[PDB]
């Protein structure tokens, strides 16, 4: 009931789903072969949120995998849990975007949109009561940023009411992976801010800093990194699938997080995450959970949340816990840092409680809050953009596929306007 289909694009998009599905199947006891092994009654109560049904007793994840180069989707079929996906559904091209936005957006990737939307049309109609589309992709990849962004624009116009979600990873300043990152990243958000109802940026810089400072793990790997997001991503929807004190769907979180239409970017994090050298000196109590859940070093976005003031936020407590100590701690959190919570919106914390904890732990927290500090990411990307454009370097590759520099100026103008408009409220007073 009120389930959501999954569409993921790009290699970074494919990988994230590669483990997000492995974890989610773990939570419901759906073995990689596809047969049931759950234990309680819950593992079969509301499983319609992500799983469909077919003859043979095996469960088919209702995912749509879209990559413009066959390498990624071919790989996903080899590793564990690489057999639950519908082989029929995969849509793949023949050339490759070559980390160029237009090539996978305007000429070819658009040319591929004929079939990919067709499968999606069938998928959405199948569900009784569709609840939204959660899209995961990378802004550092030309096709992923384009095909993902191109797909969103078509989808939104087709379902004006159904909610829309996005997981975007923006390149950090220090640890960069692409030389053309400033262009595509800046010119693609423009496509996201107008159509993307929700966004939760993830910074690859943040992960490594958390990896060495939080996990104390000697040899992290991209397999591990994909896990942190995978668990957290489940946090936003986890309470939707299982009974709890105060049910909170994806709609309600959107209800209490976005003040005005044009600010729909959030920064999130996951806790508790205790390294193996010190799990046995700490104490697992509700106050201990929150002191790590609003702290800077655990957030998923490299922007420091203390350089600005929060507008509103929601915390989705997970596990069996009683509220009275929850309310006191939260009211304690907000009322101890009046400089970091805008003064015109009282009672600026949301609360949600769900009973099932992640397998092996009792309590944890997933955070989603639109903080004005996010301007640092958008500001830094905008600046690096101005450096490259003034010399029209790297321009010919993009200008050779329809789009010219005229749209660049429009995007930068809109990009600046959102940046400034974001800070107007920070200095606003009652």
């Amino acid at each position: 009931m009120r389930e959501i289909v999954h569409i993921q694009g790009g290699q970074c998009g494919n990988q994230i789903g590669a483990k997000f599905w492995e974890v989610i199947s773990d939570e419901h006891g759906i073995d990689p072969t596809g047969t049931y092994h759950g234990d309680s009654d819950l593992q079969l109560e509301r499983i319609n949120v992500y799983y469909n049904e077919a003859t043979g007793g095996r469960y088919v994840p209702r995912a749509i995998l879209m990559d413009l180069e066959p390498g990624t989707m071919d790989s996903v079929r080899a590793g564990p849990f690489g057999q639950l996906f519908r082989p029929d559904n995969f849509v793949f091209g023949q050339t490759g975007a070559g980390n160029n936005w237009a090539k996978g957006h305007y000429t070819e990737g658009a040319e591929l949109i004929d079939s990919v939307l067709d499968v999606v049309r069938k998928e959405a109609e199948g569900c009784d009561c569709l609840q939204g589309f959660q899209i995961t992709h990378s802004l550092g990849g030309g096709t992923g940023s384009g095909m993902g962004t191109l797909l969103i624009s078509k989808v939104r116009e087709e379902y004006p009411d159904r909610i829309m979600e996005t997981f975007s990873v923006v390149p950090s300043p220090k640890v960069s992976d692409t030389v053309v990152e400033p262009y595509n990243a800046t010119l693609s958000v423009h496509q996201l801010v107008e159509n993307a109802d929700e966004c939760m940026v993830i910074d690859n810089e943040a992960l490594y800093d958390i990896c060495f400072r939080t996990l104390k793990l000697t040899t992290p790997t991209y397999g591990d990194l994909n896990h942190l997001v995978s668990a957290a991503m489940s946090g936003v929807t986890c309470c939707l699938r299982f009974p709890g004190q105060l049910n909170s769907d994806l709609r309600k979180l959107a209800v209490n997080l976005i003040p005005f239409p044009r600010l729909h970017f959030f920064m999130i994090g996951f806790a508790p995450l205790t390294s193996r050298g010190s799990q046995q000196y700490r104490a697992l109590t509700v106050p201990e959970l929150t002191q790590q859940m609003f702290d800077a070093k655990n957030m998923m976005c490299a922007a420091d949340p203390r350089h600005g003031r929060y507008l509103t936020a929601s915390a989705l407590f997970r596990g069996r816990m009683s509220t009275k100590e929850v309310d006191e701690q939260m009211l304690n959190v907000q009322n101890k840092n009046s400089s970091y919570f805008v003064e015109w919106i009282p009672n600026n914390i949301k609360s949600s409680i769900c009973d099932i904890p992640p397998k092996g732990l009792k309590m944890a927290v997933t955070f989603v809050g639109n903080s004005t500090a996010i301007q640092e990411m958008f500001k830094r990307v905008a600046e690096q953009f101005t450096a490259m454009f003034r010399r029209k370097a790297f321009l010919h590759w993009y200008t050779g596929e329809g789009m010219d520099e005229m749209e660049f100026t429009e995007a930068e103008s809109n990009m600046n306007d959102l940046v400034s408009e974001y800070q107007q409220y920070q200095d606003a007073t009652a």
Partner: protein, 50 residues
């Protein structure tokens, strides 16, 4: 009565030992890339067919 079997901590009941065979120090603290990192002694299992 109940007599204690060894001297308890007090001002001069330790004044052992400083005259030992060899004094070696192992660096348990090392700083890399602006992150604290330390040794992993005292937590080592041995082995198993598990």
């Amino acid at each position: 009565y109940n007599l204690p079997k060894t001297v308890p901590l007090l001002p001069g009941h330790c004044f052992p030992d400083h005259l030992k065979e060899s004094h070696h120090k192992t660096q348990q603290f090392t700083l890399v890339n602006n992150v604290h990192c330390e040794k992993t002694n005292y937590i080592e299992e041995k082995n198993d067919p598990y």
